[PDB]
């Protein structure tokens, strides 16, 4: 049903939990360090980038629209994600975003 990923503030995968493989067929090392945008269907990039701009400016859960994500075999699956951007309480800077990614 769902898996969790962590992203740098630019959208790069920096952590992928073990549930990702059963869902996307990628092992973690095929995603880590790559840009989330490389996997989006080009019809979804616009609204996903809009959520990107918004999750960086608030601590409230951002929920994406549905969007398509390219899996290892080239096909696309439909996801919906819940994002929380975490701010270092000391430095006051956002160090990563935690994305819970739900199938269809
Ligand atoms: C850096 C904020 C962020 C987190 C997660 C994203 O997508 C997750 C998918 F790649 C997994 O299905 C994002 O997309 C654009 C910005 C973005």
UniProtKB/Swiss-Prot annotation:
Domain PAC: 64-104
Record localization: Nucleus; Cytoplasm; Nucleus, PML body
PTM text: Ubiquitinated, leading to its proteasomal degradation. Deubiquitinated by USP9X.
Annotated ranges, domain PAS: 1-59
Tissue spec: Hair follicles (at protein level). Highly expressed in the adult brain, skeletal muscle and heart.
Chain ranges for the short sequence motif Nuclear export signal 2 as given in the UniProt record: 24-32
Cited function: Transcriptional activator which forms a core component of the circadian clock. The circadian clock, an internal time-keeping system, regulates various physiological processes through the generation of approximately 24 hour circadian rhythms in gene expression, which are translated into rhythms in metabolism and behavior. It is derived from the Latin roots 'circa' (about) and 'diem' (day) and acts as an important regulator of a wide array of physiological functions including metabolism, sleep, body temperature, blood pressure, endocrine, immune, cardiovascular, and renal function.
Quaternary structure, from the entry: Component of the circadian clock oscillator which includes the CRY1/2 proteins, CLOCK or NPAS2,BMAL1 or BMAL2, CSNK1D and/or CSNK1E, TIMELESS and the PER1/2/3 proteins. Forms a heterodimer with CLOCK. The CLOCK-BMAL1 heterodimer is required for E-box-dependent transactivation, for CLOCK nuclear translocation and degradation, and, for phosphorylation of both CLOCK and BMAL1. Part of a nuclear complex which also includes RACK1 and PRKCA; RACK1 and PRKCA are recruited to the complex in a circadian manner. Interacts with NPAS2. Interacts with EZH2. Interacts with SUMO3. Interacts with SIRT1.
Other remarks on this protein: CLOCK-BMAL1 double mutations within the PAS domains result in synergistic desensitization to high levels of CRY on repression of CLOCK-BMAL1 transcriptional activity of PER1 and, disrupt circadian rhythmicity.
The name this protein goes by in its record: Basic helix-loop-helix ARNT-like protein 1
Organism, as annotated: Homo sapiens (Human)
Section of the entire sequence shown: 338 to 441 of 626
């Amino acid at each position: 049903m769902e898996y969790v990923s962590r992203h740098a503030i630019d959208g790069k995968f920096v952590f992928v939990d073990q549930r990702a493989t059963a869902i996307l067929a990628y092992l973690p090392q095929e995603l880590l360090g790559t840009s989330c945008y490389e996997y989006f269907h080009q019809d979804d990039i616009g609204h996903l980038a809009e959520c990107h701009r918004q999750v960086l400016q608030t601590r409230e859960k951002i929920t994406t629209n549905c969007y398509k994500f390219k899996i290892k075999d080239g096909s696309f699956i439909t996801l919906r994600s819940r994002w929380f951007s975490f701010m270092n309480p000391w430095t006051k800077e956002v160090e990563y975003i935690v994305s819970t990614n739900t199938v269809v």
